[PDB]
Design a protein that fits this description.
2 copies of one chain form a homodimer. Chain A is 34% helix and 17% strand. Chain A is an alpha/beta fold. Chain A is globular and about 45 Å long. The A-B interface holds A 42, 158-160, 164, 166-169, 171, 179, 184-195 and B 42, 158, 160, 164, 166-169, 171, 174-175, 179, 184-195. Chains A, B: (2R)-3-phosphoglycerate binds at residues 8-9, 15, 19, 21, 57, 146-147. Chains A, B: It comes from Entamoeba histolytica (strain ATCC 30459 / HM-1:IMSS / ABRM). Chains A, B: Substrate binds at residues 8-15, 57.
Amino acid sequence: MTKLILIRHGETEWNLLGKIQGCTDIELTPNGIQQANEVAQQIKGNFDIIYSSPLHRALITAQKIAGDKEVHLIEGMKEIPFGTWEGHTFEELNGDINYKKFLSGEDGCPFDSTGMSIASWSKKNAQLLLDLCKQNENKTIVCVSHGAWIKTSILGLLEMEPTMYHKFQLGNTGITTFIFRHGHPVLTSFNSTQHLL
Amino acid sequence: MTKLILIRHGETEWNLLGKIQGCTDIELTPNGIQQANEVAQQIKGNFDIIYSSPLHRALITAQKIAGDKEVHLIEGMKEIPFGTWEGHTFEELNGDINYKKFLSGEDGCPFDSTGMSIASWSKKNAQLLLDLCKQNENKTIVCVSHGAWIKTSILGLLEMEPTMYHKFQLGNTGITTFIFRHGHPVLTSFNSTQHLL
């Protein structure tokens, strides 16, 4: 009865503008702080351990959810880097050879000029997540992270192809949960946002 | 701004028992009625049109959600037929040539010997849902249906491979939404169940 709970952080200013926010340590907006509270309430402490990205937008979200538990930082849960895309909107990326390969699945859907892609991040982030579940078997695990990172984890966990990435939309504070049957992750929910008013 | 919302019906006794429940017109349990009220309370009439399976369990659920709106009956929203499987638990299906295929992926994962597979229903149910959307553009559509039906609809809509069916788990009153970008369905929720108290 291992349960994995992945939670995208609250709203930032860059999120509102559509600016690709990777490694830039943007803070929550005031609405984003509220999203974190509302999602903390829904949880009502129903978990054993809670992990988080080191970026403040995640970490602050995690801390509200945790109440009185320690929030464990995992550096591997930081958001995926986007290189020369950082700061840009997707409209500003039209006619970038790498972005046409992102939409198209060519080359595993490369992220900018980082050397990495949806394909690699999926294996890589799925590997991390499993080991973290073996480490905490028969427990309910929460992980506060980011949109590109959580989406690739879903693709990695359920073995989907890189292009499926674009068929998911994961909003702020959206909950995504798995369980295991028998050794394989089973998606029991994705981007649940009913706690948002 | 076309939104498609797929909702599974409330609990029945056969659900409680793990009994495959297709053509049998089983009523809701009082819990399952409560479920229906809850999901209705969460939806608060935020939809334009609402469709339903004819089977009682769905209709009753849709009826509570619809309030004073008309529930529109679609014959093809009926649960997938399961043939011989009907009335059985998967355990009892331990050792059937077809059930092994249903897991293994052979012949597009057959259901009983109904002659149809997950493959076929993915295509068929998506085609219906796309058409129901093309006919309701820039409206929010709710559709009350069944577990297998909705799951194949997802595989169809997101063009996934039939074995993925087993990597999804849908609960009673589970909500599942789609939007379009540009004209391709994008999943924005799966199995949201926050309304259950």
